[PDB]
């Protein structure tokens, strides 16, 4: 289970994207008994918050999910080669953390919500 | 809720496969307060581990999920009639528990991972 955990942390983002399951399997498992229980409960609700974020987009039960949100060059103007073959995910997170909330807001604002409503309507004709 | 729980435990696997929801609904609900809380938390994280296993395959939100992993006759060389009309799920688990981890590894090794990557690529053309 723990084997290979974060082993691709220094890999390129393209190469680290083939190991997502090792880092996804590892997110789910007196006063000190209460401490351990608090840790376990916190891990559970954190995992559920991440899954809820994935589910309010179209990305439920998926480790890679393509969306309908266009990429804005105000967030990053690098070409795919610099991102997926020259950079790592930690560097990318450092670069893109200032816009992450804007991206999340756009992911749940229009694309999944208007998509869902449009599929509600396309199931009428 | 509890009605019919494990009632098809002695049924054939084919017949017990029509009652999966009674056994799926029943997996989710001082020092003794801590004991009850530990039990509840353990049940929650166990359920979430099972759902994570289903989701890293293509089986998210499904009680029956068809896959792209071929069956190997090194795991069981019985024909469908012996399995789904003559055997029960407990006997099948006793027979197949030695290979279960190999099957799980194959389920998350290539089929869902390469499928997902191929759907990443088919969403380009």
């Amino acid at each position: 289970v723990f084997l290979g955990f974060l082993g691709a942390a220094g890999s390129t983002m393209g190469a680290a994207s083939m190991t997502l399951t090792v880092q996804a399997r590892n997110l789910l498992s007196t006063v000190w008994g209460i401490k351990q229980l608090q840790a376990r409960v916190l891990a559970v609700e954190r995992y559920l918050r991440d899954q809820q974020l994935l589910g309010i987009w179209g990305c439920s039960g998926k480790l890679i999910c393509c969306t309908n949100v266009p990429w804005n060059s105000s967030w990053s103007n690098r070409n795919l080669s610099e991102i997926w073959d020259n950079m790592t995910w930690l560097q990318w997170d450092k670069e893109i953390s200032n816009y992450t909330q804007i991206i999340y807001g756009l992911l749940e604002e229009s694309q999944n919500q208007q998509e869902k409503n449009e599929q509600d309507l396309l199931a009428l004709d | 809720v509890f009605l019919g729980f494990l009632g098809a435990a002695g049924s054939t696997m084919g017949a017990a496969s029509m009652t999966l929801t009674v056994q799926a609904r029943n997996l989710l609900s001082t020092v003794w307060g801590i004991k009850q809380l530990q039990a509840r938390v353990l049940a929650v994280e166990r359920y979430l581990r099972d759902q994570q296993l289903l989701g890293i395959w293509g089986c998210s939100g499904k009680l029956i999920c068809c896959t792209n992993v071929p069956w190997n006759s090194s795991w069981s060389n019985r024909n469908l009639s012996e399995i789904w009309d003559n055997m029960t799920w407990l006997q099948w688990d006793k027979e197949i528990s030695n290979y279960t981890q190999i099957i799980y590894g194959l389920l998350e090794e290539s089929q869902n991972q390469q499928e997902k990557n191929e759907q990443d690529l088919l969403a380009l053309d």
């Epitope: 983002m13 393209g14 997926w84 | 191929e118 990443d120 690529l121 053309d125």
Partner: antibody, heavy 123, light 108 residues
Framework: EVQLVETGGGLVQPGGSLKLSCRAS????????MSWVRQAPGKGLEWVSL????????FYVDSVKGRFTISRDNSKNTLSLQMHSLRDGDTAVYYC??????????????????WGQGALVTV | ALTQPPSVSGSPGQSVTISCTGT?????????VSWYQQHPGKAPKLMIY???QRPSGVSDRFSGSKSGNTASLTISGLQADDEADYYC???????????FGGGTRLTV
């Protein structure tokens, strides 16, 4: 430095079968989508088939959809094209080329960058 | 298929333009039009990709452009080596991937 050498072109009776192969060198074979494009002798080029970089996705022109089978081995740096139930319209020089598509993590390569020599198939 | 003139004639020093008419579904929908040069008796060579872009090792004399459903290849400063069959290619979508135009003979 890129080299793509085709082997297996020859004469085959109508209704026969033939396996063309293309050996690649001078570049990362596993990082490129491959394609087979045929030119009949007096006519122009015609796209036959396409395979992605990993070898999991295969596309064919409808004229050879159920008959041809493109495959690749990245360990051996080989690209195979199996041909079954060969008709008279398949007489052509077949070229293996690099391109046709790319991964989602790469720029679009909707073109055939590096071509091979050619392999003559006659029915 | 893509309609292409069977022949285009020129002399050294001038500039010629080979046209390529296609359906709206292929050239009018996607900006992926490419031009190959096949000298007689040898394999094709990519001269232009993505309408305008050039590979490495290709002179500025070869250029490409698009207008609506028609893509054009301009060859300037004609030379002896330019005598070849110039083939059009267009990405026609997911169902039909690539459609090639009829070869055009250049006479210098």
């Amino acid at each position: 430095e890129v080299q793509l050498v085709e082997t297996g072109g020859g004469l085959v009776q109508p209704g026969g079968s033939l396996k063309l192969s293309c050996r690649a060198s001078g570049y990362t074979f596993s990082s490129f989508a491959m394609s087979w494009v045929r030119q009949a002798p007096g006519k122009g080029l015609e796209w036959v088939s396409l395979i992605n970089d990993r070898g999991g996705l295969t596309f064919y022109v409808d004229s050879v959809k159920g008959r041809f089978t493109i495959s690749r081995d990245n360990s051996k740096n080989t690209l195979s094209l199996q041909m079954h139930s060969l008709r008279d319209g398949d007489t052509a020089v077949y070229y293996c080329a690099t391109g046709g598509m790319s991964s989602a993590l790469q720029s679009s390569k909707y073109y055939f960058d590096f071509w091979g020599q050619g392999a003559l198939v006659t029915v | 298929a893509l309609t292409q003139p069977p022949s285009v004639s020129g002399s050294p020093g001038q500039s010629v333009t080979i046209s390529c008419t296609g359906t709206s579904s292929d050239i009018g929908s996607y900006n992926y039009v490419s031009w190959y040069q096949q000298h007689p008796g040898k394999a094709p060579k990519l001269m232009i990709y993505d309408v305008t872009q050039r590979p490495s090792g290709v002179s500025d004399r070869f250029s490409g452009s698009k207008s609506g459903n028609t893509a054009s290849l301009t060859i300037s400063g004609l030379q002896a080596d330019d005598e070849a069959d110039y083939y059009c290619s267009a990405y026609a979508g997911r169902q039909t991937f690539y459609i090639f135009g009829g070869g055009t003979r250049l006479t210098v």
